[PDB]
Design a protein around this ligand. Sequence first.
Ligand SMILES: *[C@@H]1O[C@H](CO)[C@@H](O[C@@H]2O[C@H](CO)[C@@H](O[C@@H]3O[C@H](CO[C@H]4O[C@H](CO[C@H]5O[C@H](CO)[C@@H](O)[C@H](O)[C@@H]5O)[C@@H](O)[C@H](O[C@H]5O[C@H](CO)[C@@H](O)[C@H](O)[C@@H]5O[C@H]5O[C@H](CO)[C@@H](O)[C@H](O)[C@@H]5O)[C@@H]4O)[C@@H](O)[C@H](O[C@H]4O[C@H](CO)[C@@H](O)[C@H](O)[C@@H]4O[C@H]4O[C@H](CO)[C@@H](O)[C@H](O)[C@@H]4O)[C@@H]3O)[C@H](O)[C@H]2NC(C)=O)[C@H](O)[C@H]1NC(C)=O
Ligand code: XSF
Ligand code: CA
Ligand code: CL
Ligand code: K
Ligand code: NA
Ligand code: ZN
Length: 804
Amino acid sequence: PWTATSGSCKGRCFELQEVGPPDCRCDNLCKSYSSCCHDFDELCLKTARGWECTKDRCGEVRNEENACHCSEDCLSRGDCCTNYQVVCKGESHWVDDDCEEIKVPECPAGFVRPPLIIFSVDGFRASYMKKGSKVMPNIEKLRSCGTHAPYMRPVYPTKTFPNLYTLATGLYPESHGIVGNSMYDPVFDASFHLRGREKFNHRWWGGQPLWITATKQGVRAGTFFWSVSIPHERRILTILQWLSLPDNERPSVYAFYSEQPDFSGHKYGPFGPEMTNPLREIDKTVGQLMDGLKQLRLHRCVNVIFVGDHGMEDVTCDRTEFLSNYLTNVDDITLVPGTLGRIRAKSINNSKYDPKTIIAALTCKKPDQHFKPYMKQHLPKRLHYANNRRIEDIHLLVDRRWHVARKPLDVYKGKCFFQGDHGFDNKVNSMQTVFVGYGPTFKYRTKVPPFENIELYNVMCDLLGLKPAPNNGTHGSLNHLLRTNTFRPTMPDEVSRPNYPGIMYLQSEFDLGCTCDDKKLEELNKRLHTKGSTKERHLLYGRPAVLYRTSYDILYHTDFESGYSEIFLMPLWTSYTISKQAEVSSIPEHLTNCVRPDVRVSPGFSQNCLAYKNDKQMSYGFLFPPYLSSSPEAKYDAFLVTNMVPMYPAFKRVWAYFQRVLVKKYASERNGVNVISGPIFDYNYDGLRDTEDEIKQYVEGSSIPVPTHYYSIITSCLDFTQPADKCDGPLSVSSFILPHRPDNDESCNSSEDESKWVEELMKMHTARVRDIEHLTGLDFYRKTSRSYSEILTLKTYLHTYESE
Ligand SMILES: *[C@@H]1O[C@H](CO)[C@@H](O[C@@H]2O[C@H](CO)[C@@H](O[C@@H]3O[C@H](CO[C@H]4O[C@H](CO[C@H]5O[C@H](CO)[C@@H](O)[C@H](O)[C@@H]5O)[C@@H](O)[C@H](O[C@H]5O[C@H](CO)[C@@H](O)[C@H](O)[C@@H]5O[C@H]5O[C@H](CO)[C@@H](O)[C@H](O)[C@@H]5O)[C@@H]4O)[C@@H](O)[C@H](O[C@H]4O[C@H](CO)[C@@H](O)[C@H](O)[C@@H]4O[C@H]4O[C@H](CO)[C@@H](O)[C@H](O)[C@@H]4O)[C@@H]3O)[C@H](O)[C@H]2NC(C)=O)[C@H](O)[C@H]1NC(C)=O
Ligand SMILES: CC(=O)N1CCC(c2ccc3ncn(CC(=O)N(C)Cc4ccc(Cl)c(OC(F)(F)F)c4)c(=O)c3c2)CC1
Ligand SMILES: [Ca+2]
Ligand SMILES: [Cl-]
Ligand SMILES: [K+]
Ligand code: NA
Ligand SMILES: [Zn+2]
């Protein structure tokens, strides 16, 4: 597009409103667009005399050619060097002052609300906070006086643009559209790349970023984007100048961005000796901002967020897996390479391209293979990485410390020159990044548990008094970060009330093709259990609330309670408690193939055994495990047709090991557990519960729908000295969402005993309770003694199984 660079930046330097059409620009992005007016450098990027006052410059006569000023008039003009008051007025640097609690905002007249400054640092690995602490005195003061987490979990892929735009929107990359640092949209036949102009087009960038949310609601916003060649000292000086604008013109939200330490980390590795200097330099920049805020009397008024996008791992050229070592047809594909792989067909006009044969040729081919292929819908649900046409059907998850590439010549175009990289699974320790919150709205000297970057947008909205756009955070889950909370969450209303059926059908009314070998005062006890006498033991936190319109029944039993769906012909949820002392037993010989009609539920709303006999692929399992029955008589309950769910034989290997061995291990380790298990249907891989008309597979000849996944939520007392069923304080939870697959190809060791691979699979598919809520339309923990904000934090917890 033609620019008339003929105009001037006089009185326009770093203007807030971006200009067109062929007119030249003076804003902080004009350099990226190559559209700055001819005099932008002269007027706007002054450098004379550097960035610091010195004794002899004090009270100088103003010289407008200087980078910053030491003249008497500078504070009124808003353009002193950040160390002016220290050098010329005997003041102390902010870092040398004692921490003092900020109980209330202390702001100059005309400030309507405390401003928010986001200070984002690329590649700032979480352990830098401890490991680089001797050389970062300013950052360490923010961290220990403010609110901080030991680390913050980024989104997958742990690349720069997906994570910065998640910070800004509160959305998963599948929903905001920025799904990697490089992308091809098939409906655009356009690529998006780090370097280039295509990324400037707004069509890639979905959702509603914080600056738009603010502007729509009458809060003014600084530019979050920075051109790479504007130096850091000039970015800081520009933010401080904007903060001296008149009340009607002054933004309330600002962002600073640093390319370091990422830039050096790629060259030298995360802990190369060359990394000390980039850390010192970011600390100095923090020092400049805080000294400048202190001059303008805003150091006890502004809220500051020091936040990273992802970490950095050791990665070298010789740790590259090559697709040419696996596939013959290597030139029929296009690969997006590196710390993750995405594979598509080279040519739309190629009809002999087979994803199925590509996966098979990539599956368990070499003993210590350093990647694993997945159809995108089979990736761990915790990654939320599938519901976007820019994400290719075929995906490779790459081991930490490794790369994937198509052919050797792609790498050794042969010397190396890179020692660090990122992009791996977001549960990986080296990928974690940082959060510090400092200012009047944050708590004083407070440590909070680790949390996910998707939650920050809601909190930044609360900090500015904005109503957040719809997003993937759970609003209220981070209230514990804040001294004054704008947001008080309330529980969603239950939409469907359950039926409580009694005995309504005679045995001979059922014609389900099922058989079971199952033919005083003990009689009253049986009825009590069926009516809910033990329900307080097995349903510890209330029944889950059904948040959509449906028909379902509550079923009580000695050992477990369930919510049984008349529409899906199976439980939506099944809840049971296993104490530390519980005994495991076997399924007796005469009960191996036992399935029993449930006389509370009509034949018309039941599964049938004939369908499973006819369907040669599909078998069945049970939600409450018969192995954990409390007595030989209660065990008959576990064989009810209302406790049955469809399972592939290959999946029953996983499920039976979980129910027979692991549940008991967890009860032993945690001093009792309460378990809620159920089916999930997500045939369109959008992370959301399917309606019945979205189901793509049924048990042959029937209306019994086949789940895509099975979940379990496992709860106990955070103080493990108290048993799960008598717990007075906070709770502890782990959960999973296992894919319901007809093979165990995902597990390369699946020919061995389950003791060698099953728990490993489960750990990979760890989940948050909130992930399960989205996928089921249920709302858990409705009746506890805990506060709702606390329950929201619990529902967002992810058990990661990483070491320390
Ligand atoms: C994480 O959080 C997010 C955010 O809350 C959740 O994602 C939301 O989920 C909703 C349900 O799936 C979905 O609702 C859809 O949306 C349809 C309209 O969508 C467009 O308009 C949106 C609103 O924009 C305005 O407001 C926002 C403020 O937030 C501003 O930013 C805007 O400027 C507007 O003022 C807009 O956000 C949305 O953005 C997507 O599409 C853009 C352009 O393509 C992209 O740039 C952007 O990145 C978004 O892309 C994502 O989302 C799309 C799906 O929308 C997806 O394909 C991509 O892969 C990507 O993931 C749009 O521009 C609306 O028409 C839908 O209604 C239809 O379906 C239902 C039944 O299913 C009916 O109720 C309805 O009558 C209608 O049926 C008809 O259409 C059917 C399908 O076409 C058809 O088959 C049928 O026959 C009928 O004719 C529905 O409401 C939201 O759009 C979505 N939002 C976002 C931002 O992603 C997400 O679910 C959460 N994740 C988890 C795991 O919880
Ligand atoms: C969508 C839109 O309005 N567009 C589309 C994109 C356009 C555009 C035009 C020129 C550009 N020049 C340089 N850079 C690099 C940069 O600014 N980085 C790495 C910092 C950064 C990037 C993202 C977020 Cl979210 C962020 O904020 C933060 F840090 F807070 F997350 C901070 C750009 O990204 C860039 C983008 C502007 C208009
Ligand atoms: Ca779905
Ligand atoms: Cl990428
Ligand atoms: K079968
Ligand atoms: Na296998
Ligand atoms: Zn990087």
